[PDB]
Write a protein that binds this ligand. Structure first.
Ligand code: L3A
Ligand code: ZN
Ligand code: ZN
Length: 393
């Protein structure tokens, strides 16, 4: 059989646990959670990367649904609860296809019955409003990882896409990591600065993840992971879940985006300005310099290097579907994973290597978080510390 046929067979046995899909945010923005208007039991190809049929075609057996909210708007906690509610409603609406999962055992139970294990991950520490009790409430509601920052610094952690702030984690930032360890919430180091990665690895007593980051050595962008950090994963026990975002994984796309941003500033616009006038300027740039396109090969290049440095036991996949408008060819939506697995087969990845990448590493890591939490919950009570106490006025 072809590599693609073999890939599908392999995924039927050990499906993908995807680290980060922004369907909830897409539903929030497109239709304000009018789920009938984007029914994922029907074909949503015109609007979304994600629906149930494409998840099945793609060999997705578990999904961390992102409950991302904007850090640059007020009411982050309320919005996070709305995102969590969206995930709950999707699970309730589609019991034939989705099963809520809170634990590694739940993931295996879902796999045994052929339902997609549905977990939640918060994307940025702003979702807890500097409140450890709020962190505990998110865990109680089912959140099983939290990205420590999004694109901007928060009061206690530095983002990779912002200027240096506290220098990694502040004292309160370390307290957040300790509390996540005690609760059994995975520390997610996507988005954070390399300093923050190192501070988190110093502090965490549980395996950490990168829910959607690729390799900085392969493509130099602050959203990707440095080799020295990848090297620490085997000792920490965690995993890096490669992402597909073209402007992170393809050198030509990083360069093009930098030039596009420079061009915007040349016209007196902030690079993120979305006014009609700014859009005209960007359109003119793309007219004379077409947007480069990544491929499955681009993503496999990251995985090859990440495997060499981090080890096969420390890898996963986090597509960022519905979180990015652009995708590599062959990975245009959630049905694409078999194309990546086929490429890896062609590059000599073994069946057991691939089962770790898709399924086994993610289950091990969540189980490990539970194990560390058991010890910490027996050893001490929850923290009552405040950011004022630990970081000062
Ligand atoms: C505004 C919403 C769509 C942002 C997404 N939650 P994101 O996952 O942070 C996508 C981005 C390319 C990244 O991961 O850096
Ligand atoms: Zn992200
Ligand atoms: Zn996201």
């Amino acid at each position: 059989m072809t590599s693609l046929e073999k890939a599908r067979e392999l995924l039927r046995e050990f499906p993908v646990v995807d680290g980060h899909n922004d369907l909830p945010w897409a539903l929030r923005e497109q239709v304000r959670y009018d789920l009938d208007a984007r029914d994922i039991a029907a074909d949503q190809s015109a609007h979304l990367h994600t629906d149930l049929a494409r998840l099945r075609s793609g060999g997705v057996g578990a999904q961390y649904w992102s409950v991302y909210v904007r850090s640059d708007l007020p009411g982050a906690v309320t919005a996070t609860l709305e995102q969590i509610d969206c995930v709950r409603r999707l699970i309730d609406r589609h019991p034939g296809e989705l099963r809520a999962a809170l634990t590694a055992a739940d993931m295996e139970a879902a796999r045994a019955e052929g339902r997609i294990a549905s977990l939640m991950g918060a994307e940025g520490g702003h979702s807890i409003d500097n409140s450890l009790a709020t962190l505990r409430a998110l865990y109680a509601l089912g959140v099983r990882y939290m990205t420590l920052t999004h694109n901007d610094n928060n009061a206690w952690a530095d983002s990779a896409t912002d200027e240096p702030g506290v220098g990694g984690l502040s004292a309160f930032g370390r307290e957040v990591v300790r509390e996540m360890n005690r609760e059994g919430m995975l520390v997610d180091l996507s988005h954070v600065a390399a300093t923050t990665m190192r501070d988190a690895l110093d502090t965490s007593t549980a395996p950490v993840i990168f829910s959607h980051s690729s390799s900085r050595a392969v493509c130099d962008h602050p959203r990707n992971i440095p080799d020295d950090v990848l090297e620490r994963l085997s000792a920490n026990g965690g995993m890096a879940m490669v992402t597909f975002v073209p402007k992170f994984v393809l050198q030509a796309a990083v360069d093009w985006t930098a030039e596009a941003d420079d061009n915007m500033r040349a016209h007196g616009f902030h690079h993120l300005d979305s006014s009609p006038e700014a859009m005209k300027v960007h359109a003119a740039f793309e007219e004379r310099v077409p947007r480069p396109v990544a491929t499955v090969s681009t993503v496999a290049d990251h995985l090859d290097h990440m495997r060499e440095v981090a080890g096969v036991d420390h890898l996963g996949i986090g597509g960022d579907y519905d979180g990015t408008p652009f995708t590599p060819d062959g990975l245009g939506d959630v049905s694409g994973y078999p194309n990546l697995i086929a490429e890896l087969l062609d590059r000599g990845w073994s069946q057991s290597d691939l089962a770790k990448l898709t399924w086994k590493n993610a289950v091990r890591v969540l189980d490990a978080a539970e194990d560390v939490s058991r010890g910490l919950r027996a050893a001490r009570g929850p923290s009552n510390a405040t950011i004022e106490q630990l970081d000062g006025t």
